[PDB]
Design a protein around this nucleic acid. Structure first.
Ligand SMILES: [Mg+2]
Ligand SMILES: [Mg+2]
Ligand SMILES: [Mg+2]
Ligand SMILES: [Mg+2]
Ligand SMILES: [Mg+2]
Ligand SMILES: [Mg+2]
Ligand SMILES: [Mg+2]
Ligand SMILES: [Mg+2]
Ligand SMILES: [Mg+2]
Ligand SMILES: [Mg+2]
Ligand SMILES: [Mg+2]
Ligand SMILES: [Mg+2]
Ligand SMILES: [Mg+2]
Ligand SMILES: [Mg+2]
Ligand SMILES: [Mg+2]
Ligand SMILES: [Mg+2]
Ligand SMILES: [Mg+2]
Ligand SMILES: [Mg+2]
Ligand SMILES: [Mg+2]
Ligand SMILES: [Mg+2]
Ligand SMILES: [Mg+2]
Ligand SMILES: [Mg+2]
Ligand SMILES: [Mg+2]
Ligand SMILES: [Mg+2]
Ligand SMILES: [Mg+2]
Lengths: 142, 184, 258, 160
RNA sequence: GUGAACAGCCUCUAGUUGAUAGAAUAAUGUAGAUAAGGGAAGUCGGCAAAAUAGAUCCGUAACUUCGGGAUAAGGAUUGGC
RNA sequence: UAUCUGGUUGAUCCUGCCAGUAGUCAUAUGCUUGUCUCAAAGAUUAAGCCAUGCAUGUCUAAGUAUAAGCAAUACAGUGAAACUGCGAAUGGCUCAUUAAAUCAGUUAUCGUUUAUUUGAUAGUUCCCUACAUGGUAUAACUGUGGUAAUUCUAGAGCUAAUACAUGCUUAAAAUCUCAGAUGUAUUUAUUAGAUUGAUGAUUCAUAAUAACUUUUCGAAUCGCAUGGCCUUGUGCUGGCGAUGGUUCAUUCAAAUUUCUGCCCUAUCAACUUUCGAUGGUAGGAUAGUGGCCUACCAUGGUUUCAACGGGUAACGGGGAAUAAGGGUUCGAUUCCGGAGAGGGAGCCUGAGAAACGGCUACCA
RNA sequence: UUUUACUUUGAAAAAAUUAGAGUGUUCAAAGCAGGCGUAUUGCUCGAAUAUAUUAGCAUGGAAUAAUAGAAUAGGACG
RNA sequence: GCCCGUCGCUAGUACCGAUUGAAUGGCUUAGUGAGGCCUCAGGAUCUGCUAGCGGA
């Protein structure tokens, strides 16, 4: 991810040791997991070099809560996006509806590429920031 | 005391939150241990559930693992040379997780001699069985000439009371030497 | 709020106890124990409201103090011991044994059983885990752990428990066509056979039950209790066998005795 | 009436937050601490009464110092304590000459002997033996259960 | 040189060392200053004096001709290495 | 029980409100008041102030008994005081704060603590006691006191533990190191954990190697019966229990947490971000996640789909009144959740308190 | 096996309260009681059901309303 | 017939208003800052081991 080792600390997957003694093939052993619920781990997640300890595939977070879908309205944060979730709220007295929306801050892995639009599917994880509780699990850049 | 609640720390919209539920004990924080080096002084903190944490102040020795051969020798910590979070911890020689420290390396050299017998830094066919695949690395062994090994602290001295860690190798060693030569 | 609650106000007790509204302010809070607080049945309730042997809680305590009552083989002198599903209440004085099961209306029915089969109990396998030193064990619906289980025992299966040696004698697996008890929800107390199990990965697994009257209802996997194979229950079923007659048919059965 | 404190080292009285295992304060609740005023350590004219301990008796006896002398209220209770009191060795079966006393209420003078703690008794020996036998019996039971579970695993792995 | 500076202060080149002197150290003066506690009670009147002051950062009201008021007011820091 | 009527005019038909009408677990108040059942009740104004008294203590067979307390060859019964353990964090009260806060329904803990209950679980301990160690321990008790006064306590003499601190016995078998070690608890690193267990999913459970601990656990405890074998000895074995204990599970819980839903107001349109606001990295802290805090970095985050601000004589809900239907109004209050104990703040003990019939300080 | 809204059914929405079944509190408000033959060494029925449709969950449907396919073919099946 | 407004009296209600008005409460810059907690120290006197050396 554009010279991944751009931080003051060494970026690496915890407890994933790459032995300089053995003469292995890749020499860059990368750990990954299946996110579950039929969410396919992408090829960028498989073959990438990013660390992203908050990644739902190559990180230490797990998708175990609600699965929501929304429209990305902001990609201006680092590995975090804001999705707009539009819905209709029913007002019983008038027997009608009113448009409502709730912005959801979602962590986006470098495996996915997300721009404004790009209806995404997000899965609930443990709190990984003050506001973020969801990880992008399907990009659907359409 | 220190509170970890989100009743302060105004909401994502920027609104200031009114104060309900005056500070709760289950939300408490505590002060950093700020582990120094030498003359071991470990205090017991009674934590929630009746459990116990160990605030290590002034830690001199730690268990450091080579991780290339799996030795994990107990050694003396010399000082802190790098810290990704604050150079002030390096300046004050504060022991803390992920800190880059220098360790004595003499137990590791002694183990290497008693295991391979290959004069790293200067029962007969056991060394023959531990065959010519005995060179460790040109950067892990060049430190033995000075008798100081760069290591990364892996435990949390303010949490567990220990200052264990592992000897840097490969790309991690290269990155940390590049950081050291950039900042010194 | 500062710690665990120790009182249980009346109208906050589970309604399946059928407690009086105006008997007092409080209800017997089920102590900590094997089954649950909601899904339990305190010995005081079972002795003063279901068997009418004792008149007061003082008399319940007097009964319990002389080792008369016995839950699953042990004395259980606790006034509010949380007895629950499949638990065996045996009193040496007035020697009869009850297996606490759910009637068609979802209450803990008084179900007399015989000594020759009060020995064992059934238990739904809550989890199958590897314990310390690599020893596998099963955790059952009543909070029992059993080491070295059959390697074919999975979750949602039922295990027969000796209750004297406390070991597994037999096990029934979760499959289509097996007799199941409903231990919660709207259909609590019904008995039927498994038609199909919808998976719902992530969410809640659903299972369809078909009674002997061909009524089919779906219920959460959490509250189904396999009790054997169709026509051969491993335990003695209650008087109604979980049929869930409609209200009209219930009225007809009530009026059939004139 | 404010008591002197052991090491305050002041000529007056000051207020301290006192703790369980200190003098001049008895906690009424576990963990209770109270701010109480106690008097300093160095004596001065303010003291109403001092308390002294004789460490050397030099000359003519005081009329309430040696002639008026009271005995110890309780004899040793623990077995080894009585052994150290009477100089006895280990193997001396100390239950016979334990200190006794008479209660003269109805001309009966029934002796009231104390109980002795840590006394080596066959009941304690039986308890220890039962504990050790329980330990070995559960160990054997677990070993045999593991053996038969391994046998079951091999018998079910034979079907490949 | 210091310093924003042709400010003030010290110095280099150059120039001067020219003002009637000596001895004492009273009052009252002229000029320069300090002062416990109070703080304009003095006085026509705060006259005189004192207080403030440079720079950096924060913050700045009424009113207004919208340009200002404004350095408003009110605060914090300043050396050496 | 889907209802209207009187009042503008000389008269009429309208609009339109005033008035009438009925109900109110909706509050007063007036008059009156015979009987039975049922029973709200200092919420509104003052979460204003409080004299006095009570409201949290507790002992079994089974922790500690020499009361000089009672009773007819160690006490063996009862039993004051005290030590120890547990509880006192439940209950009860009130609605002051609180408007995305609480709360309701619904989720997660693969993000944590959990006294107690229930179940399971520990042959590995030692570098001259185990037929059982110490006071390094003392209370009550005895005696001498001080203070006007408090559940104030001082000096002196004992005395015990399931209090405090040490400290062995368990062979047998077993694999590595070069005779020793390998249990379990803690920390780190590494490995297996497949397609040899499980999950939708894990760096999960678990196992292994190397080591590390201001060092854990591995009953020096108690009651009732005493039985059996034999070299009949201070012999050797063996019951039922109680209590305590490491870990796992369970239960009671707790703490965060997904989604959606709150009254009026724009005579509040921009708000947040210097003093954390949104996110990333790393650390610290926490029981644990997390800007919860710190250092660096980026400039983000919310908003006319009403943010932010202001008001509430606003605790939220289950519910209550009235109601053809739709609605309107109320809910301090018998249940659930929250918060508080004059206002704040800090904290000890404890599993659980930021406790108030616990403490400390400030303010009144 | 695009994405929704919508709608059917099911689990869910504590109890109390409400509607409501049964039941001579003497009637009734209420309560969850109780009932039946005797000189017992006792037999037995019950404490149902419906309601919350905001939001989430499971599920059938595909009208209605929206949404996207292949146009510089970078298209669909071997 | 109905009718409008100024002016005058009585009563009530609200408004503007010098007073750099007053009081109460919330928030807050700056300054001071109790108290407990963590921490750098400190050593009454308390007791064990051979003048020393550990522990509380
Ligand atoms: Mg200059
Ligand atoms: Mg002066
Ligand atoms: Mg002065
Ligand atoms: Mg002044
Ligand atoms: Mg004047
Ligand atoms: Mg004058
Ligand atoms: Mg004048
Ligand atoms: Mg002047
Ligand atoms: Mg200024
Ligand atoms: Mg001006
Ligand atoms: Mg009216
Ligand atoms: Mg009031
Ligand atoms: Mg309470
Ligand atoms: Mg693990
Ligand atoms: Mg972090
Ligand atoms: Mg309200
Ligand atoms: Mg209020
Ligand atoms: Mg309310
Ligand atoms: Mg009020
Ligand atoms: Mg309440
Ligand atoms: Mg409170
Ligand atoms: Mg008050
Ligand atoms: Mg308080
Ligand atoms: Mg009180
Ligand atoms: Mg209280």
């Amino acid at each position: 991810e554009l010279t991944v080792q751009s931080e003051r600390a060494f970026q690496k997957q915890p407890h994933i040791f790459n032995n300089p003694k053995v003469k292995t093939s890749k020499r860059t052993k990368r750990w990954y997991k299946n996110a579950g619920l039929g969410f396919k781990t992408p090829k960028t997640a498989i073959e990438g070099s990013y660390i992203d300890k908050k990644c739902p595939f190559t990180g230490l977070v797990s998708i175990r809560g609600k699965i929501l879908t929304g429209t990305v309205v902001s990609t201006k944060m680092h590995r975090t996006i804001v999705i707009r979730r539009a819905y209709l709220h029913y007002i019983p007295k008038y027997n009608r509806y009113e448009k409502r929306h709730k912005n959801v801050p979602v962590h986006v892995s470098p495996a996915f590429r997300v721009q404004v639009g790009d209806i995404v599917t997000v899965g609930q994880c443990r709190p990984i920031s003050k506001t973020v509780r969801f990880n992008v699990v399907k990009v659907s850049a359409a | 005391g220190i509170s970890r609640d989100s009743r302060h720390k105004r909401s994502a919209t920027g609104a200031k939150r009114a104060q309900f539920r005056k500070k709760r004990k289950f939300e408490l924080g505590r002060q950093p241990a700020n582990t120094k080096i030498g003359a071991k002084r470990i205090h017991s903190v009674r934590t929630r559930g009746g459990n116990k944490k160990y605030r290590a102040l002034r830690i001199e020795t730690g268990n450091f693992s080579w991780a290339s051969e799996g030795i994990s020798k107990k050694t003396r910590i010399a000082g802190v040379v790098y810290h990704p979070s604050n150079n002030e911890l390096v300046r004050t020689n504060t022991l803390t997780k992920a800190a880059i420290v220098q360790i004595d390396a003499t137990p590791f050299r002694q183990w290497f001699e008693a295991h391979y017998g290959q004069t790293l830094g200067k029962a007969e066919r056991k060394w023959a069985a531990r065959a010519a695949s005995a060179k460790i690395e040109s950067s892990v062994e060049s430190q033995f000439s000075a008798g100081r090994l760069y290591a990364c602290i892996s435990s949390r001295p303010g949490q567990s009371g220990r200052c264990d860690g592992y000897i840097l190798e490969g790309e991690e060693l290269a990155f940390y030497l590049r950081r050291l030569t950039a900042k010194k | 709020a500062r710690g665990p609650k120790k009182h249980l106000k009346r109208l906050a007790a589970p309604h399946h106890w059928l407690l009086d509204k105006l008997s007092g302010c409080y209800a017997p809070r089920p102590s900590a124990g094997p089954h649950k607080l909601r899904e339990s049945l305190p010995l005081i309730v079972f002795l003063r409201n279901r068997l009418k042997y004792a008149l007061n809680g003082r008399e319940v305590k007097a009964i319990l103090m002389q080792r008369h009552v016995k839950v699953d083989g042990k004395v259980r002198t606790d006034t509010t011991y949380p007895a629950g599903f499949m638990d065996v209440i045996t009193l040496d004085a007035t020697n009869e044994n009850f297996r606490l099961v759910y009637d068609v209306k979802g209450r803990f029915a008084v179900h007399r059983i015989t000594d020759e089969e009060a020995s064992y109990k059934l238990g739904k396998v809550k989890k199958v885990q590897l314990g310390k030193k690599g020893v596998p064990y099963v955790v059952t619906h009543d909070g029992r752990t059993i080491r070295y289980p059959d390697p074919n025992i999975k979750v949602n299966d039922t295990v027969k428990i000796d209750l004297a040696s406390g070991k597994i004698t037999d096990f029934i697996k979760f499959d289509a066509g097996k007799l199941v008890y409903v231990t919660g929800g709207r259909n609590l107390g019904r008995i039927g056979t498994i038609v199909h199990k919808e998976r719902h990965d992530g969410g809640f697994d659903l299972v369809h039950i078909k009674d002997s009257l061909d009524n089919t209802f779906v219920t959460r996997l959490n509250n189904v209790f396999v009790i054997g194979e169709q026509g051969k229950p491993y335990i003695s079923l209650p008087k109604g066998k979980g049929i869930k007659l409609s209200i009209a048919e219930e009225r007809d059965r009530r009026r059939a005795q004139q | 009436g404010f008591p002197m404190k052991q090491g305050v080292l002041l000529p007056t009285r000051i207020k301290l937050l006192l703790t369980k295992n200190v003098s001049c304060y008895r906690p009424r609740r576990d963990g209770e601490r109270k701010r109480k005023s106690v008097r300093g350590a160095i004596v001065g004219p303010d003291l109403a009464v001092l308390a002294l301990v004789i460490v050397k008796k030099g000359e003519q006896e005081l009329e309430g110092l040696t002639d008026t002398t009271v005995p110890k209220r309780l004899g040793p209770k623990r077995a080894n304590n009585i052994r150290k009191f009477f100089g006895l060795s280990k193997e001396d079966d100390v239950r016979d000459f334990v200190i006794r006393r008479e209660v003269t209420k109805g001309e009966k003078t029934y002796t009231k002997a104390p109980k002795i703690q840590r006394l080596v008794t066959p009941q304690r020996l039986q308890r220890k033996r039962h504990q050790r036998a329980l330990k070995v019996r559960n160990a054997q039971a677990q070993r045999e259960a593991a053996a038969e579970y391994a046998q079951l695993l091999a018998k079910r792995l034979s079907e490949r």
